[PDB]
Amino acid sequence: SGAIYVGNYRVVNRHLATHNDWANLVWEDSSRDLLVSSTTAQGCDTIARCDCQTGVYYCSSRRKHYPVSFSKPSLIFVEASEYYPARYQSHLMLAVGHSEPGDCGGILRCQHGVVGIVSTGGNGLVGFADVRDLLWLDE
Numbered sequence: 174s175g176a177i178y179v180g181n182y183r184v185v186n187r188h189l190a191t192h193n194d195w196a197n198l199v200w201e202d203s204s205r206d207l208l209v210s211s212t213t214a215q216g217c218d219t220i221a222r223c224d225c226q227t228g229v230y231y232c233s234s235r236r237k238h239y240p241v242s243f244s245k246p247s248l249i250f251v252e253a254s255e256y257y258p259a260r261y262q263s264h265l266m267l268a269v270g271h272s273e274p275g276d277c278g279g280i281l282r283c284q285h286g287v288v289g290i291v292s293t294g295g296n297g298l299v300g301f302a303d304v305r306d307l308l309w310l311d312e
């Protein structure tokens with residue numbers, strides 16, 4: 174689990190969004206596994222607007238942060254799960270690192286701010302949903 178709180182927005186994995194997230198919906202995209210809802214309190218996070226390919230992410234299954242080298246946001250095949258049919262997920266960045274079910278929502282950050290959140294994993298890989306192109310989160 175996990176979320177990004179920026180301005181008056183909360184960014185979460187679409188498959189983990191709550192009844193409250195859907196009742197306060199701003200935008201969602203099933204092909205990206207993202208959902209953004211509105212908040213009454215001002216957020217704690219700031220968003221990176223960069224092309225970094227290295228960063229540090231939080232891994233809840235190890236209660237630890239790990240450094241990673243990750244690919245540019247791209248279209249990647251994701252096998253069927255109880256949350257989605259087999260499909261191509263867009264704006265996804267892969268890296269070698271630990272992840273297991275429960276790790277979605279962990280934040281990836283570079284020196285410029287928040288880059289994205291854990292969205293996929295397995296086999297010694299971890300996938301992050303990029304949020305750097307969502308310029309409206311800042312305004």
Ligand SMILES: NC(=O)[C@H]1CCCN(C(=O)Cc2ccc(F)c(F)c2Br)C1
Binds near residue numbers: 262277
């Ligand atoms: N973005 C998706 O389609 C997600 C939806 C939930 C299910 N997805 C997973 O990847 C679950 C998973 C499996 C094995 C792992 F080792 C792991 F870390 C994770 Br997270 C795809």
Ligand SMILES: [Zn+2]
Binds near residue numbers: 222223286
């Ligand atoms: Zn950066």
